[PDB]
Amino acid sequence: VCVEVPSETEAVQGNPMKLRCISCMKREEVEATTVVEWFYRPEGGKDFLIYEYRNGHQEVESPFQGRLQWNGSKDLQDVSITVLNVTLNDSGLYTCNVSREFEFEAHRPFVKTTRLIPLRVTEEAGEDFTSVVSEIMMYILLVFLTLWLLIEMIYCYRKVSK
Amino acid sequence: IRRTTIKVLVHPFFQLFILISVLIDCVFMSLTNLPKWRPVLENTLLGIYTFEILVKLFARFLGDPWNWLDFSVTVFEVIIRYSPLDFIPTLQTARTLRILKIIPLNQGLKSLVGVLIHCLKQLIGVIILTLFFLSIFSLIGMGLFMGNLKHKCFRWPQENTGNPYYIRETENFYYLEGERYALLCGNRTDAGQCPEGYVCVKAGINPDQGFTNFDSFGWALFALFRLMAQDYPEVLYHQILYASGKVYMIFFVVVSFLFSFYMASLFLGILAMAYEEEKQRVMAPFTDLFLIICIILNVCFLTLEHYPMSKQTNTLLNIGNLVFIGIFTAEMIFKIIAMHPYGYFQVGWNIFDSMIVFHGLIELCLANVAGMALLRLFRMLRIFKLGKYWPTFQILMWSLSNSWVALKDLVLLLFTFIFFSAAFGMKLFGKNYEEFVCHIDKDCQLPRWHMHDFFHSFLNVFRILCGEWVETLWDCMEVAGQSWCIPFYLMVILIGNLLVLYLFLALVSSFSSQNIRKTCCKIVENNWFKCFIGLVTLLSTGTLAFEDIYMDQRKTIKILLEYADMIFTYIFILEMLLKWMAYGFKAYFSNGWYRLDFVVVIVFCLSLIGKTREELKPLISMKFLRPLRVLSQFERMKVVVRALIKTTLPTLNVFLVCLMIWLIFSIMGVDLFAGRFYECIDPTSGERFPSSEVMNKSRCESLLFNESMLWENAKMNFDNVGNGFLSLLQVATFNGWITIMNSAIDSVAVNIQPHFEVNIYMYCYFINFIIFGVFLPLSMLITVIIDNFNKHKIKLGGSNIFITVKQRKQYRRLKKNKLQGFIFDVVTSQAFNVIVMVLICFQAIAMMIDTDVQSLQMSIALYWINSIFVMLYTMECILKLIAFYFTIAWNIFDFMVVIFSITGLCLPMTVGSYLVPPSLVQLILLSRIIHMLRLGKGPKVFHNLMLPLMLSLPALLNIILLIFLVMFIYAVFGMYNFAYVKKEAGINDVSNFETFGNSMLCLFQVAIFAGWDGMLDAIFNSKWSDCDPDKINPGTQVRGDCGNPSVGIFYFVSYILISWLIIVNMYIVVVMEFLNIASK
Ligand SMILES: CCCCCCCCCCCCCCCCCC(=O)O[C@@H](COC(=O)CCCCCCCCCCCCCCC)COP(=O)(O)OCCN
Ligand SMILES: CCCCCCCCCCCCCCCCCC(=O)O[C@@H](COC(=O)CCCCCCCCCCCCCCC)COP(=O)(O)OCCN
Ligand SMILES: CCCCCCCCCCCCCCCCCC(=O)O[C@@H](COC(=O)CCCCCCCCCCCCCCC)COP(=O)(O)OCCN
Ligand SMILES: CC(C)CCC[C@@H](C)[C@H]1CC[C@H]2[C@@H]3CC=C4C[C@@H](O)CC[C@]4(C)[C@H]3CC[C@]12C
Ligand SMILES: CCCCCCCCCCCCCCCC(=O)O
Ligand SMILES: CCCCCCCCCCCCCCCC(=O)O
Ligand SMILES: CCCCCCCCCCCCCCCC(=O)O
Ligand SMILES: *[C@@H]1O[C@H](CO)[C@@H](O)[C@H](O)[C@H]1NC(C)=O
Ligand SMILES: *[C@@H]1O[C@H](CO)[C@@H](O)[C@H](O)[C@H]1NC(C)=O
């Protein structure tokens, strides 16, 4: 029921953007004490801080707060984050280092899975390339398919005349 | 000396006295456990039966085989009782054999069994062909699956009391919440998946105490015999598809097609021939409408009773009943005025109506207080009064009356055999069910199904006759050992099925007795135009399969489909507005097929507006009607739809009678069980409290000091007629019926905690339902379907009504050296041909020896055997090339087999690479055994038994294509509705609606009735809020988690009806061809 999908890596000045991030559990049945950390995104030392999760949400206690919102799922399967009014200064990498712990009352295994994305807030988004090339291909096909019929209702008509 | 004997032996009282004596013996042995008289009675009957022997043996004695039983039992008993021998348990077993005397002591049954055993000799061919095929497919099963079910999730890395027969090794392997056996898994991409921190390994025991495996021949034959019956199969599918990929699902489809259909059609057609071979050898009279209205309203008043029900409507229904007896007791004392009653009590119907008025003036005075509630159960008998006016019911009943004298004997024989098997089983196995109870059930108590007493053994036999045998046979083998349990079960299964089916055929036999216009009118009909739009129709159909949960992950494809939908609607619009130019406007709507096309053009138009506005988004569901365009496009579909209409619609007339009987049983249930299925449960574990802790509801809702308790209803109940019909349908398909029966037999009273097995006798209700509501109506339908199939087969002739006029020519074509290389004179010889066959046979028998646990000295001595066989095959192919073409198709098949065999035995030059799997070559060589069905080169009966499949392939192809189109429509609609349902019960990691593949496997196991209740019970998650309406699902635009019962019920019921109606015709197609060939 979970599905893993990359994020858009493209963002428009004057809008929010959602940084989706998904990390499925191989068995849906078990339960795990998740921890989630998002890293700094800057052209020097990226690792600094963004928005960590321990047992309840906490505050960045630095200057990367206020324009942020938790958009994650209730069971922490998905930990998506929305940034507000992205500005030209905002740029580069984002990294999400989720980790989990299981409890089978025998062996307590621990697993860790990084996930990282670039972003650049271009001055304005151009149109998507696929969603114009496909509209050209469609309109061309619908032109051909409507000259063909006309050619037939010339040839057959001329034949029927006699 | 021997004279006076006759004057006894032939006087009828010598028959009647012994019949009475046997009925006393068999009652007092079985329906009683009253002792202190069993040392007197047996010493009496050992006198009587010896008087019988010492009479009968003087007149004649061994001329009749029944006299071997009579003598051989009683001589052995006489050797026991009075000698030092004392095999007491064995003595009491043999006496159960006396029950069978009812056969020879009733000449009717003696002759019926005589002709049945005579006609048994017609079957020998089919039984051998069936065992041959079971052996081949079980060798294939050992090829594909041997060892797989030992897979488990093993804890890794490795780090450093109770009932002994239920300890789990949970420190080492991973178990689900409640299951007894470890989770199956596999290395493949689509197998099961381990939890984190576990690795897949082959270790330890198989499931089911070892009885479910493919690790040797024998048990594989057990598994295939289980699959042929398709008895409780779906857990085997689950285990195989967890141990190995979904790709292996092809195997079970092929197996169920060969065995559960064709072989059973051969048996049914042969017994249906044998039956006819046997049979050929033998003052206000007119004012009625008032009273029929004052019947139908009385019927309707009965249906409104339910639970709960307020007094201000109970008193309504009470006055209603009084009023209707205030009418019937008027009209009786009108009709008893017709001069006298001596005609009144002469006509058959009034000797029923006066019973109705006597019952209805019992239950109104001095039967209101201090009277038993079952007196009211007879009120339902009133619905039969409607039958007085209804010709169909009357002529069916009359047809049953005619046949009475024959059916009596078949019913009495079947009852005799059930009673014999029940008694013999109780004496043979009963003690073991208590000596070793601790294996069968935790807490060391007898389970619900056992053999410790006569009534439970009787129910167990009736259940074996319904099927269901494997789940009890596992306990039989677990308690009494296999060598005893297997012959008993196999005997009951075989002779039971034979009697049941011969009775079914007896019932069926009983019942059956401006030139632009010419331009467009050409452009529409050129064949290229047809094929183009046909292609567009199949493209526009297949594109719905891509809309699974991964739609948003396939980011690119979505945009292409988004434009393709508009291309397709454009083409169909230029089709419509051309046909209206051509045919003329009005003539377009006259023709029924173009109307369906028009409806599909509307579906395309609504679907494309809906997605433009959110408030109209629900319209986008309409597009799932698109596949219906296929049905009107292709000539092959229309002939099939017409054949189904021509054959099956006329059954509607008799269907109302079956609905009437089902309504009778539904009311008869609502009266007897409504509101009593409530129970008090632990809200976490779902098990009940015992009756000692929480006897009534008041303690189930205590005043908060200790309230770890929940009072709730049961998913299936008889609280009103609409739940009744659904519970009845669930009984009729033998799915989940055991949970209903457990609810019934546990139920006490409206607010009383149900207690284990209190009124066990309610099993009579379901026995009676299974006899009268299912078995008889089913044949009442099949006989009408056959009568119309014959009608139409005569109204035009034709090979079938299920095939197009072009295919009839195909049907009629299908039905039809000198240079001293003398090897030509050798390869032709019988002596060489028989040798080739002996080699093929030896190679198969030399394959049966293999097993999973196996020493290396044996494995290499099998490897070099298969290598010798590839050498022999290559040598004979080289010799054949001297006496010589690649023209013969079988000689192409053999040369392919040789090439593939060597390119596997030696692989790439015997040193080249790996991962060519061992035991591929064995299956390659095995494939040649198909030669033993060819006309000139094997047993002639195997060809004569395979001929119907050849002569019926086209109609089956057409029907299979229509089944596939219907399964496609239902798959797409379920894939849109029932994704995101929480995984539970019959919804799991393999059968679910996440994708088209899994939806097709669900609809398959539904069509075979392999547990549709387990899916419906998952759809009913909203029935007590076991769900989360707003749950975010990652990667997906859809929020929530909930099924919808109202849509679920409709979906499953309609699919079950349509599938059953198609499959019945698919059976008819084969059975009538077998019966046609067998005419010669
Ligand atoms: C518990 C046994 C399993 C373990 C071992 C299995 C070993 C393989 C057994 C070899 C069987 C070979 C023949 C199989 C025929 C099966 C019958 C059959 O399925 O065909 C039709 C039904 O069969 C018939 O109509 C004809 C059956 C007569 C066959 C035997 C004639 C009498 C033989 C009596 C000998 C007593 C045997 C004593 C044991 C040594 C279809 O009906 P259905 O089962 O699909 O539907 C079930 C409805 N309740
Ligand atoms: C005049 C021409 C004659 C030609 C004859 C040709 C026959 C054509 C064949 C038509 C194809 C029929 C399709 C299926 C036939 C098998 C039906 C059967 O024997 O039993 C069914 C009846 O259903 C049952 O209830 C089985 C258990 C019945 C219990 C037996 C106890 C009753 C005995 C008491 C006798 C009293 C009867 C009353 C007499 C007045 C079981 O259905 P199923 O599970 O096999 O369906 C397939 C699943 N997809
Ligand atoms: C009238 C009917 C005629 C009856 C006569 C039938 C006799 C024909 C016998 C020939 C059987 C052909 C089966 C060949 C498939 C090869 C299976 C295989 O071994 O594939 C390997 C490759 O894996 C695959 O599964 C690839 C996809 C093939 C699976 C297909 C299974 C369905 C087979 C249908 C059986 C029906 C044959 C009879 C048709 C009339 C598995 O290797 P592994 O390493 O994964 O397993 C061991 C590791 N522990
Ligand atoms: C066409 C391809 C792609 C799929 C296979 C089509 C046909 C052969 C499939 C689809 C549905 C299948 C049927 C589903 C139900 C039954 C009833 C069972 O008692 C015998 C097998 C039988 C009759 C199956 C035979 C094979 C079957 C008819
Ligand atoms: C130990 C249990 C054995 C039970 C079966 C005993 C053998 C019964 C045989 C009955 C044969 C009936 C046919 C007789 C000949 C005929 O009429 O054609
Ligand atoms: C026509 C009769 C066929 C009889 C075939 C019976 C096959 C089923 C019994 C299989 C037993 C296999 C060996 C049991 C002991 C073990 O598990 O090692
Ligand atoms: C893909 C959805 C399932 C479709 C199932 C039904 C397929 C029917 C195929 C009919 C083949 C007709 C061949 C002739 C066509 C032509 O004349 O061009
Ligand atoms: C998250 O993963 C690494 C783990 O080595 C962690 O040390 C660091 O904070 C993050 N780096 C990356 C590349 O994700
Ligand atoms: C059952 O209810 C009765 C009254 O209907 C009450 O007297 C009795 O105590 C109840 N049983 C309990 C509380 O176990």
Description:
The complex is a heterodimer of chains A (162) and B (1080). Chain A has one domain. Chain A is 20% helix and 22% strand. Chain A has one helix and nine strands, in the order βββββββββα. In chain A, the strands form three sheets. In chain A, strands 1-9-6-3 form a four-stranded mixed beta sheet, with no helix packed on it. In chain A, strands 2-5-4 form a three-stranded antiparallel beta sheet, with no helix packed on it. A two-stranded antiparallel ribbon of chain A has the order 7-8. Chain A is elongated. Chain A starts with 9 loop residues before the first strand and ends with a helix. Chain B has a domain at 516-648: Helix Hairpins (Orthogonal Bundle), CATH 1.10.287. In chain B, the strands form two sheets. Chain B has a two-stranded antiparallel sheet with strand order 1-2. In chain B, strands 3-4 form a two-stranded antiparallel ribbon. The longest helix of chain B has 39 residues, at 391-429. The chains are: A alpha+beta (162), B mainly alpha (1080). Chain A binds chain B through residues 1-5, 22, 24-30, 73-74, 77-78, 100, 102, 104, 106-107, 109, 111, 130-131, 134-135, 138, 141-142, 145-146, 149, 152-153, 156-157, 160-161, and chain B through 155, 159, 170-171, 174, 176-177, 193-197, 515-516, 518-520, 522-523, 549-550, 552-553, 556, 559-560, 563, 566-567, 570-571, 574, 979-980, 983, 994, 1031-1036. One 2-acetamido-2-deoxy-beta-D-glucopyranose binds at residues 39, 47, 95, 97, 114, 116 of chain A. Chain B: III repeats lie at residues 514-816. Chain B: Residues 32-35, 83-86, 146-216, 245, 302-310, 367-372, 436-453, 481, 547-554, 614, 674-720, 748-760, 852-855, 915-917, 979-996, 1021-1044 are extracellular. Chain B: I repeats lie at residues 1-279. Chain B: GO terms for molecular function: osmolarity-sensing monoatomic cation channel activity; sodium channel activity; transmembrane transporter binding; voltage-gated sodium channel activity.
